Amino acid sequence: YLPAVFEEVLDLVDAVILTEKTALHLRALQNFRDLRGVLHRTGEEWLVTVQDTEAHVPDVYEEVLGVVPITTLGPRHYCVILDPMGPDGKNQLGQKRVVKGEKSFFLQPGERLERGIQDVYVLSEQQGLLLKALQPLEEGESEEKVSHQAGDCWLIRGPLEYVPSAKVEVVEERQAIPLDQNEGIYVQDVKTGKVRAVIGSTYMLTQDEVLWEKELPSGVEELLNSAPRNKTR
Amino acid sequence: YLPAVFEEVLDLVDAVILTEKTALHLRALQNFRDLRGVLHRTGEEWLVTVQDTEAHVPDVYEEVLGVVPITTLGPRHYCVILDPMGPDGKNQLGQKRVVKGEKSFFLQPGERLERGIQDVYVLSEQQGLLLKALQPLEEGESEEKVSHQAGDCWLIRGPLEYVPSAKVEVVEERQAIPLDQNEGIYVQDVKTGKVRAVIGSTY
Structure with a gap:
């Protein structure tokens, strides 16, 4: 290209x-x-x-x-x-x-x-995901196809694959509760405060439940006779 | 090749x-x-x-x-x-x-x-492979031809040859449990927590 007289070249x-x-x-x-x-x-x-x-x-x-x-x-x-x-x-x-x-x-x-x-999020039969519905009552667009109110909490469980929807937030991963016969954890239903001890097979905390603290007054050294005992056990 | 006048040679x-x-x-x-x-x-x-x-x-x-x-x-x-x-x-x-x-x-x-x-993966009658189905319910394309849900675990055993499919991941190699009479290991079914002691033949 020959640059014209009225034109001037800047660069390529x-x-x-x-x-x-x-x-x-x-x-x-x-x-x-x-x-x-x-x-x-x-x-x-x-x-x-x-x-x-x-x-x-x-x-x-x-x-x-x-x-x-x-x-x-x-x-x-x-x-x-x-x-x-x-x-x-x-x-x-x-x-x-x-x-x-x-x-x-x-x-x-x-x-x-x-x-x-x-x-x-991929979770097995022994894994769970705690979720909070932070937006107004999504009836559809979820695995359960059930409405969740604006703020409450629910747990999703089972060998499925989950993805955070555009209206929900993940809270925590429910796991680590293996249970045997005559063995269990103290659980408190925070919604109504019914503390109870689940015993037997493996049990996962429901959406409204949480581990509960059990205190033994000066009775730890008697029944435990190094590591601190699991008071929630 | 004689380089033409209008041409110029760079290299071979x-x-x-x-x-x-x-x-x-x-x-x-x-x-x-x-x-x-x-x-x-x-x-x-x-x-x-x-x-x-x-x-x-x-x-x-x-x-x-x-x-x-x-x-x-x-x-x-x-x-x-x-x-x-x-x-x-x-x-x-x-x-x-x-x-x-x-x-x-x-x-x-x-x-x-x-x-x-x-x-x-080649495994004998005394070797096993633990697998996790990390993708949505492959009914076919596996040796068992049985659907596995998205996340659960299963064990494949027997004198066969296994290859990791495009939808599964290997976890561990099940082995090292030789058992004799009046000898065994304590096993816990983690799904339901039924701890039990298997005794006798190799398990």
Whole structure:
């Protein structure tokens, strides 16, 4: 290209190589039309992938911010996207989506993850997850398909795979209670305060139950005759 | 070749010798057509083997990354390929395939192995493998052909050969319990906590 007399050359522009693992983040410096014919007003941000071109050329009306890697969710990996895209095409500020099921996508502009590619909760028949329904009475969208009020607690158990829904928060992992005959733990139903001792087979604390403290007045050394005894046992 | 006046010589290019044990990894610097007539857009990566040519010539539109050795799986060797090829021809990012049965292949671009040419689990009548079904209820694709829920545990035993499926993980190798008459171990069924003493034959 011979630079015309009325033209002056600044520098050469290199088209960033667009792979299946990379995307180009661009913002418009002015109202214009890109190479593929997409309206881009000033301040708008968009993504360019291999579906558009194999190597997009940075334009004078396009400002490059960086390269967006494809966040790949594995078969047991989930993620919570903050400030997502709505169907209108804007940041849904203040909300969050949950994505799972072997998905691979590029981070749309103005998005960031809660933790980032979390491991999906897998729990056996001897594991449990305590949950709190922090939002107004989700009847569906849960494994149980049962409404949970705004604030209460419940336990999910069984050899299944759980993922934190967009309206629930995990509290703790219920485990570590193996029980034998004539052996047990003191449990207190915090809802109504009915302290009781479960004896026999392995028992897991219900949503409203918790371990209870049993005190023996000056009787520990008599019945125990190094390590401190489990008072909840 | 007499270099033409309008041409200028850079250097000579040597065709990499393609053997049955080697493959050429290439990426396109621009949209072009290779020697054999294959469309190659910018950024695409492909492999060239003896099936294509005995010695492929690095082109100006082709960038050489390295040589891909043929990962040979022995008769008792398996492997778990991360980010495999789907039928469409792209990296299946986040998934994994299991390959066994005396297979020999070249690593497709954008692939790497979990451990690499693992020894296939062979267990006798006195050996066992504890497994956890970490994915949703595989009815088939297992030796037992029985569904296992998402998280529970089960034991596989017998003089067979096992390979970790693409949906299961191995936990431990059950062994070291030889028992004689009036001899035994105290065992606890953790599911229900029924502690009991097994006595007599090996258990």
